[PDB]
């Protein structure tokens, strides 16, 4: 129930599988030949996504999954101005 979102640098962002299927592209990568359970966690390679943005992506996964169907007013996801453009292209590619 854990997946290892390896970034381009080599950082192995081990996030829960329920969180990773928030993004459509990761759900597609974990389907087909990519669902082969190598080790216990499925190593997803992201050779085009750096670590400083994949960390924000995983934080968004654990934020949306926790804050889904929230009764209280939901706080906005904090995206720094220097990361915003690179996290924009990572949000489109990952379809999250």
């Amino acid at each position: 129930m854990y997946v290892k979102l390896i970034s381009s640098d080599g950082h192995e962002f081990i996030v829960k599988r329920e969180h990773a299927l928030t993004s459509g592209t990761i759900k597609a990568m974990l389907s087909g030949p990519g669902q082969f359970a190598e080790n216990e966690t499925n190593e997803v390679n992201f050779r085009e996504i750096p670590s400083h943005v994949l960390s924000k992506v995983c934080m968004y996964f654990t934020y949306k999954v926790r804050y889904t169907n929230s009764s209280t007013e939901i706080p906005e996801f904090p995206i720094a101005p220097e990361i915003a453009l690179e996290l924009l292209m990572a949000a489109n590619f990952l379809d999250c």
């Binding site: 854990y2 640098d9 192995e12 934080m59 654990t62 934020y63 804050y67 690179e86």
Partner: protein, 105 residues
């Protein structure tokens, strides 16, 4: 409910623990992730051993400073064979430093 980033060398475990849960459960949750016993690992909140007895709320992991938007990191070492190693937590990357338009140039 507290959210953490258990980074050791380059891995970054994105886990969620109860505020009242102790550090021993935080070490035991890595058993299902990296499959190494909690005896041979110790955590690190910015050069601070996190012993099994004390709870997460005692060692500063309040839910205000470790919210899901920006979870609080915690180090880790796996004792190698018998002696623990230093925190080799590598920084993620340097995002492209956008120039300040108000900077005189």
């Amino acid at each position: 409910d507290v959210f953490l980033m258990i980074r050791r060398h380059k891995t970054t475990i994105f886990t969620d623990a109860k505020e009242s849960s102790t550090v021993f459960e935080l070490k035991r949750i890595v058993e299902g992730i990296l499959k190494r016993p909690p005896d041979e690992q110790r955590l690190y909140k910015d050069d601070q051993l996190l012993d099994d007895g004390k709870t997460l709320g005692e060692c500063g992991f309040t839910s205000q400073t470790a919210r899901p938007q920006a979870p609080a990191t915690v180090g880790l070492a796996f004792r190698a064979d018998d002696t623990f190693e230093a925190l080799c937590i590598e920084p993620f990357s340097s995002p492209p430093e956008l120039p300040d338009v108000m900077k005189p140039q």
